[PDB]
Design a protein around this ligand. Structure first.
Ligand SMILES: CC(C)(O)C#Cc1ccc2[nH]c3c(c2c1)-c1nc(N)ncc1CCC3
Length: 293
């Protein structure tokens, strides 16, 4: 029931090696580029699929070309059986890398430097008029080249939504919007089925970095969406920072001040990470936790 069988060739050029990801809305393959001779990521959507989402993912990926933390766009197309996009192949995701660490915790020096890169990628997608709406560790992957192995890449625009109109204006929010993303790193706004904003992507970043540094979130054992929302709604969030750098209280306070309409202060949040590093003498050139160094 896979859309492409192994050794299937797309457009006489990309040869399927194996499936590397799957879900309701399509599949991702590692393929060999019979022209450039590197391997690539080949993401496919069944032609017959009711909700056609790939066309928007490709539009977002093309808008982001030239930005750091973005896969290179190789090709796309359309035929009677499937839509596809070919993109740069990336490596290990941050969820797998976090689980591989002894206590499921990154050093502050890894956490803060990933934070800078993820924040850059969030501002980037926001700058072309889209919300990601499923910011989570498994959607960020480290590079797999000498030129990219300390670079973090933003994946999966499958749940993204344009928050501007044709003419650059902020769109009206729907009075109710069904939150369809991952429970653990969802904002209290998303839990309430409110229209998501730029601030909700930065809430997801906040929860990710607490989990990175501390090794857990208070609700991690609870999978039910409506229970997790009720736990978050009451949780004293300044408790989450007990063992985090104090400069995180600026980040929390800022994103708590934001609504759907307000452009976030990305530079305020960047300065939290940069001041946290400077305080501790963390350098940018440091080993990540998962490297031999
Ligand atoms: C078109 C766009 C940007 O929206 C997308 C997307 C995308 C969704 C789901 C995915 N699952 C995986 C990947 C992936 C990508 C993946 N992608 C890449 N390029 N390298 C490596 C991997 C790791 C293997 C698993």
């Amino acid at each position: 029931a896979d859309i492409l069988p192994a050794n299937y060739v797309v457009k006489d050029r990309w040869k399927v090696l194996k499936k590397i990801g799957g879900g309701g809305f399509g599949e991702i393959y590692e393929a060999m580029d019979l022209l450039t001779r590197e391997n690539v990521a080949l993401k496919v959507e069944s032609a017959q699929q009711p909700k056609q989402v790939l066309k928007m993912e490709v539009a977002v990926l093309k808008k982001l070309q030239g930005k750091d933390h973005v896969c290179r766009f190789i090709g796309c197309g359309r035929n009677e059986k499937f839509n596809y996009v070919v993109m740069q192949l990336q490596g290990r995701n941050l969820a797998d890398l976090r689980r591989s660490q002894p206590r499921g915790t990154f050093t502050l020096s890894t956490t803060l430097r990933l934070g800078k890169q993820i924040l850059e990628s969030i501002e980037a997608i926001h700058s072309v008029g889209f919300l990601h709406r499923d910011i989570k560790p498994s959607n960020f992957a480290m590079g797999r080249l000498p030129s990219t192995y300390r670079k973090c890449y933003m994946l999966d625009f499958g749940l993204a939504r344009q928050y501007t109109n044709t003419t650059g204006d902020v769109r009206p929010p729907r009075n109710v919007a069904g939150f369809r993303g991952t429970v653990r790193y969802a904002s209290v706004n998303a839990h309430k089925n409110r229209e998501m904003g730029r601030h909700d992507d930065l809430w997801s970043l906040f929860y990710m970095l607490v989990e990175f540094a501390v090794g857990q979130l208070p609700w991690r054992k609870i999978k039910d969406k409506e229970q997790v929302g009720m736990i978050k709604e009451k949780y004293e969030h300044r408790m989450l920072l007990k063992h985090m750098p104090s400069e995180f209280h600026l980040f929390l306070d800022h994103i708590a001040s934001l609504d759907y309409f307000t452009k976030p202060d990305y530079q305020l949040i960047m300065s939290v990470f940069e001041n946290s590093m400077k305080e501790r003498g963390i350098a940018e050139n440091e080993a990540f936790d998962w490297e031999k160094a």
